[PDB]
Structure 1
């Protein structure tokens, strides 16, 4: 629990913001039928033009203000176009001589917006929010969104609007929404607020640098979260880890000044437990690569505080699950947390180490540390006797060359479990794609001396090879593995996505 310091100025906890301005926003959803009132703040119409690419803006909603109605006449609005993410907004006096701002965000030409399209719409809305002092935003939907996409709009809106100022040395108070069939959308609001925080909380852990967020401070943070949500909790220290023979996980942490800490939180429904689930996140608080130092061009060592993104997603999931309280399930939230460093004490390339299931592993590359920690976490997970194990991890840079920065990859040993993940991707709107575990490549992990190799020498499909490795540590339980190495960090916006929180929560809930 006590965070070691090198100098007295070294931080001993991760700063965490729980009560955010987003939580003070009162949201009201009205049906478009009856007309829209425009009384104050900013009012933005979400507008498309099907077929007509870069077509003119045309507002179809009745507005119950004569000055604003005149502004929104076809002749005026056609001066503007609906190209995706394009916006205009104008200040004017309404019927009461009150200052109001009115504008639109273009939603392009397709009737159904993808999650990527919707993020661009939101980003354009958020730019307006960041540039105007407003007590209120009103958004009018003249496009089609289903319940999940509506909730996604709110989650993204909240997440993108919120600004993380923890390391630096006026938000709207009201949100109105006009949408057709408003009554069906109302229940999405408070769910969105919960999903927003899980995601934002995960983002806070990820964005926190490795001096602040280390294995001791991160496990401490998880205990605090568990205490607030009344989850059972257990942090495993080195002595216990040694007793459990977690040789793969411990070896990765040998070169760190921070002792390894294994996080185990448990949610348990009040009723009968019908499904048991273990969620496992990769928890490397900084990945230097170890003796295989990240020194090659493009290795992005300055990003590597993000290598606990999987742990963050899992803890973000525990927030949502602990808040929403699903029935009939028992959820274990697990992460083998450590730091991968260079030291007289570090493990070396070539070292042979022994995992908790007795398998000996030849280390081919100390920068393939994630799969070693996951190996012992997977053995620990299966001993819990669960129905499903799902891990999520920034595991392989190869993901950038396969699916890229938008879609995460999912691998697994059970087709039914994979389809549940894919369905959860659909309803969470966090995109995932099923990639194969190709058994033909398994032979490349046949070590000359140890039971198995950590990495392949010859096969470049490393996301698949890593999955083959992980599979060796799940013996008879449905397991899926989500590789978020490509999708976790938003490179353009210079911040985490908190990717996976909503995916995992939808998986648990539905």
Structure 2
């Protein structure tokens, strides 16, 4: 492809194509290529004869003349978290997946689904089923929630992104039956819901996986246009170029973008709402959209600069867009959702911002840019101002903002910062439902003193100690106090080092939060 740096052309998308149903079929009767059973440590208990006490495992073992309990014992499988046994026999394949002794909802069922997907891929299975060894004392509603979390683990666990690999094998998984957790309209509705969330998660992973010569600011804006065109009855789009953002006086955003003359910036505005008449709560989801971040003149240097992973500095924007993709299918009433991303890349050239430059955001405040590698908060300053100007009641921003948050919270837990206690409670509860990991961090106001400039209204970059907190405090200067606002620093969990791949972190939590408004 001749306009792309390095002539790289992506292959066709690998988004999963799986037909999912909830069935009542007795597990012993089910037919297909693979049955995955989620078993807790208690589920694995054995009697005086070393036989399974769990009625389902007892029955399956009995059909296999003891082969299942023999193999489990030899392999020391006792239902612990992370354990699995895989048995191929005449007629099919069974895998037991350990759930541990404190099975948490929905993450345990996500992991059951992921394990079922990994075992499907390693035997090239096409049609699989998943059941729990026990559903005793789970309510009808808990079983429905466990069903849709299993479906999520299977769909997302099946996804392998092979767009940039010259040779690879397509996924073979075609269907999933979820057994023993309920049938009929309500469970099917909840599974459908999970599938819509998964399509947004997968779009998120694809946008972040793709390198920055493929996903440029223009391409990110085209991706937002494609979402609006797909759901054009409920989502509209406005893309602003650099000239329009200049008329809107977005000096902090345009200053970050100034160096990157080859891949011009675009400011993305999507708006979801159903065309009905009821009152709508107005919400904004703002995502940091640095399609690449070199650091600018404050170039990222050192052996763990991670400069080579900075295509993932649009990870917040990928979550906002994935949330739009999910909500276009789900079509909730009662909400109007603005999805806003100031997309650009942070490069080095003769046109670029210098360290020490003073830039003026669209609310008139001046910022001394003492480090050009703290550029995401400058693009967010203008995005947050624009979001407030659309008349929204509540805003969540997601940004890969600081290394400091990963020091604080490790790679897997995002830090949530907000002046507004009710909004914190809403987001914590949304994350409890989605299974995603986040943690409220304090907006310690006394650290604002370190952000003073000798020349402008403020600097952009505080000391390393407390760096995620002064990031949050900086963003607060650009948010109208009448709007509830929470900032989620997702530098860690947007990317998995162990998988070397994007996670699509944030999409499911944002969708839950919208639906709970």
1:382–1:474 Cα contact (<8 Å) kept: yes
Change (3 A) 1:297 1:54: farther
Question: Please, which runs of 5 or more residues in structure 2 have no aligned partner?
Answer: none
Return the alpha-carbon distance in structure 2 between the equivalents of residues 54 and 483 of structure 1: 47
The question of 1:248 aligning with 2:246 is answered no
Change (3 A) 1:156 1:76: closer
Return the alpha-carbon distance in structure 2 between the equivalents of residues 57 and 477 of structure 1: 61
Matched residue SS, 2:340: strand
Return the alpha-carbon distance in structure 1 between the equivalents of residues 324 and 4 of structure 2: 32
Partner of 1:360: 366
The question of 1:295 aligning with 2:301 is answered yes
- The structure 1 residue matched to 2:446, chosen from 428, 435, 440, is 440
Q: Which stretch of structure 1 is more off in the superposition, 388-397 or 67-76?
A: 67-76
The question of 1:61 aligning with 2:56 is answered yes
Return the alpha-carbon distance in structure 2 between the equivalents of residues 302 and 57 of structure 1: 53
Return the alpha-carbon distance in structure 2 between the equivalents of residues 6 and 188 of structure 1: 41
Partner of 1:96: none
Change (3 A) 1:14 1:473: farther
CA RMSD of aligned residues (A): 2.7
Partner of 2:163: 166
Partner of 2:268: 263
1:14–1:205 Cα contact (<8 Å) kept: no
Matched residue SS, 2:238: strand
1:35–1:63 Cα contact (<8 Å) kept: no
Report the alpha carbon displacement of residue 274 of structure 1 after superposing the two structures with TM: 2.4
The question of 1:46 aligning with 2:38 is answered yes
2:274–2:331 Cα contact (<8 Å) kept: yes
Return the alpha-carbon distance in structure 2 between the equivalents of residues 4 and 376 of structure 1: 34
Q: Which stretch of structure 1 is more off in the superposition, 180-189 or 225-234?
A: 180-189
Partner of 1:37: 29
Partner of 2:190: 188
Aligned residues: 495
Partner of 1:141: 132
Matched residue SS, 1:281: strand
- The structure 2 residue matched to 1:26, chosen from 12, 19, 35, is 19
Return the alpha-carbon distance in structure 2 between the equivalents of residues 193 and 261 of structure 1: 30
2:11–2:162 Cα contact (<8 Å) kept: no
> What's the CA shift string for 1:48-99, capped at 9, x where partnerless?
1139999999443178889735346656644442222222222222xxxxx3
Report the alpha carbon displacement of residue 125 of structure 1 after superposing the two structures with TM: 2.7
- The structure 2 residue matched to 1:109, chosen from 86, 91, 101, is 101
Q: Which stretch of structure 1 is more off in the superposition, 373-382 or 447-456?
A: 447-456
Q: Which stretch of structure 1 is more off in the superposition, 480-489 or 68-77?
A: 68-77
Change (3 A) 1:165 1:100: same
Return the alpha-carbon distance in structure 1 between the equivalents of residues 306 and 464 of structure 2: 23
Report the alpha carbon displacement of residue 258 of structure 1 after superposing the two structures with TM: 1.2
Partner of 1:385: 391
Return the alpha-carbon distance in structure 2 between the equivalents of residues 301 and 161 of structure 1: 29
Change (3 A) 1:66 1:242: closer
Question: Please, which runs of 5 or more residues in structure 1 have no aligned partner?
Answer: 94-98
Return the alpha-carbon distance in structure 2 between the equivalents of residues 65 and 379 of structure 1: 61
Partner of 2:316: 310
- The structure 2 residue matched to 1:467, chosen from 467, 472, 485, is 472
Report the alpha carbon displacement of residue 132 of structure 1 after superposing the two structures with TM: 0.6
Return the alpha-carbon distance in structure 2 between the equivalents of residues 57 and 429 of structure 1: 35
Matched residue SS, 2:285: strand
Change (3 A) 1:39 1:310: same
1:216–1:258 Cα contact (<8 Å) kept: yes
1:379–1:474 Cα contact (<8 Å) kept: yes
Report the alpha carbon displacement of residue 151 of structure 1 after superposing the two structures with TM: 2.2
Partner of 1:503: 509
> What's the CA shift string for 1:98-131, capped at 9, x where partnerless?
x311231122232x23665555544433331121
Return the alpha-carbon distance in structure 2 between the equivalents of residues 301 and 439 of structure 1: 31
2:115–2:157 Cα contact (<8 Å) kept: no
Change (3 A) 1:412 1:71: same
Report the alpha carbon displacement of residue 5 of structure 1 after superposing the two structures with TM: 4.3
Return the alpha-carbon distance in structure 2 between the equivalents of residues 361 and 290 of structure 1: 16
Report the alpha carbon displacement of residue 163 of structure 1 after superposing the two structures with TM: 1.2
Report the alpha carbon displacement of residue 249 of structure 1 after superposing the two structures with TM: 0.2
Change (3 A) 1:419 1:130: same
Return the alpha-carbon distance in structure 1 between the equivalents of residues 392 and 51 of structure 2: 54
Q: Which stretch of structure 1 is more off in the superposition, 301-310 or 178-187?
A: 178-187
Change (3 A) 1:128 1:52: closer
- The structure 2 residue matched to 1:416, chosen from 388, 413, 422, is 422
Change (3 A) 1:57 1:302: farther
Return the alpha-carbon distance in structure 2 between the equivalents of residues 54 and 219 of structure 1: 58
The TM-score with structure 1 as length reference comes to 0.90
Matched residue SS, 2:415: strand
Return the alpha-carbon distance in structure 2 between the equivalents of residues 165 and 52 of structure 1: 38
